Design a protein around this ligand. Structure first.
Ligand SMILES: Cn1ccc2ccc(C3=CCCNC3)cc21
Length: 263
């Protein structure tokens, strides 16, 4: 199974991850509904994403720790089929939310004056209610608790990630082009948005991409170590802990609001 000494090392590596995922994603929620500066229609995208992150960290991580360190699935076919489907529903509801947050972050730059009148909270709510529906329609497409259909396994990874990745890298390379085109505030206005954009579009790729590449690489059947895949699995669940910080710390409004709650 494991070393026991390690088992306490793995559980403490997690647990802290859970506390960090339900500390940022909750600080975002207690911040949008609390500060009169974030009461924008566009700020509801960060509350549903935070809810999804808090849900993953406390509904799929506690049991992933169990399946991996214990070795067997203590439960059977009554929180295992629910766990393997609530994972694909809580991570595909974070990737697709990151895609939406970037599309509403790009239509308001390229279509700047026409989009505000089409940005009412009703539209934001109707987009949040659709991202969630699609996130759950990918999870449920109508003793080891390990994932077990090649044709579907691709459809879902490509729609769940490749698509949100390709439509979010483009929405950030056509925003970096627009913004640097405004410059043509002294050698740091650009040097800051080269980093504010690089972190935003790179933490995603360095957290989630390796897992999905390996999963479809094994979907085609190219061998990936049994280990060196467990790092990737846990790497994604650890990206939801950074998501609440990436989309909030680079914002002066959010930063001044956090100062009030934690003065
Ligand atoms: C097989 N598959 C298709 C889409 C999709 C989305 C997320 C995940 C997981 C996220 C972290 C580790 N557990 C699985 C798996 C997924």
């Amino acid at each position: 199974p494991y070393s026991l000494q390690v088992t306490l090392t793995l559980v403490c590596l997690a647990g802290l991850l859970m506390l960090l995922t339900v500390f940022g994603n909750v600080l975002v929620i207690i911040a949008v509904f609390t500060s009169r500066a974030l009461k924008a229609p566009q700020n509801l995208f960060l509350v549903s994403l935070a809810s999804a992150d808090i849900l993953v960290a406390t509904l799929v991580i506690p049991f992933s720790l169990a399946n991996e360190v214990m070795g067997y699935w203590y439960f059977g076919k009554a929180w295992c089929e629910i766990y393997l489907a609530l994972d694909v529903l809580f991570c595909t509801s974070s990737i697709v939310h990151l895609c939406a947050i970037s599309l509403d972050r790009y239509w308001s730059i390229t279509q700047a004056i026409e989009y505000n009148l089409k940005r009412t909270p009703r539209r934001i709510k109707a987009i949040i209610i659709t991202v969630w529906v699609i996130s759950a329609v990918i999870s449920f497409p109508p003793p080891r608790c390990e994932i077990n259909q090649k044709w579907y396994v691709i459809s879902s990874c490509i729609g769940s990630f490749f698509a949100p990745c390709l439509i979010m890298i483009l929405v950030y390379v056509r925003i970096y082009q627009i913004a640097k085109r405004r410059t043509r505030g002294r050698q740091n206005r650009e040097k800051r948005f080269t980093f504010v954009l690089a972190v935003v579009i790179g933490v995603f790729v360095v957290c989630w991409f390796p897992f999905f590449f390996t999963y479809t690489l094994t979907a085609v059947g190219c061998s990936v170590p049994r280990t060196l895949f467990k790092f990737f699995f846990w790497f994604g669940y650890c990206n939801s802990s950074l998501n609440p910080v990436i989309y909030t710390i680079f914002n002066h409004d959010f930063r001044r609001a956090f100062k009030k709650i934690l003065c």
